[PDB]
Amino acid sequence: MASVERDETREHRIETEIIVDAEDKEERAMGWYYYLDDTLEFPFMGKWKKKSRKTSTIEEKTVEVLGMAPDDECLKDMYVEVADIGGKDDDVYTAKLSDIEAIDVDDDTQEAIADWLYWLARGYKF
Ligand SMILES: [Ca+2]
Numbered sequence: 342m343a344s345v346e347r348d349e350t351r352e353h354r355i356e357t358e359i360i361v362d363a364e365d366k367e368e369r370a371m372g373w374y375y376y377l378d379d380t381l382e383f384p385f386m387g388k389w390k391k392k393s394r395k396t397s398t399i400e401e402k403t404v405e406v407l408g409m410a411p412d413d414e415c416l417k418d419m420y421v422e423v424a425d426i427g428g429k430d431d432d433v434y435t436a437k438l439s440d441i442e443a444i445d446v447d448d449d450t451q452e453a454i455a456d457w458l459y460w461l462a463r464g465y466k467f
Pocket residue numbers: 362363364365368
């Protein structure tokens with residue numbers, strides 16, 4: 342639980358659109374995956390604020406975000422394909438959406454990310 346709520350409007354829009362028929366874990370994951378992709382307008386630039394290896398601290402890296410991972414990944418958690426801008430600029434990886442923040446993106450893309458970060462802080466429902 343966390344108080345990451347402007348009002349119960351978010352909970353009701355999750356309930357009446359994203360997960361309305363979903364409660365089996367695969368459906369919960371797919372409901373989130375479908376509406377998050379559709380809201381996000383990839384490609385976009387972001388910071389991979391990777392949870393550190395040392396502690397609950399952050400090891401940031403600057404990345405280009407190509408798209409959400411396959412549905413085969415997105416059954417377990419929200420994930421995104423990413424390419425390192427910092428040095429490689431020629432190779433690709435995958436990151437949790439839970440460890441990404443967008444940079445200079447449109448409002449709808451940024452809202453999907455912020456809303457997912459609220460769900461992350463809330464402690465999930467699947
Ligand atoms: Ca069901």
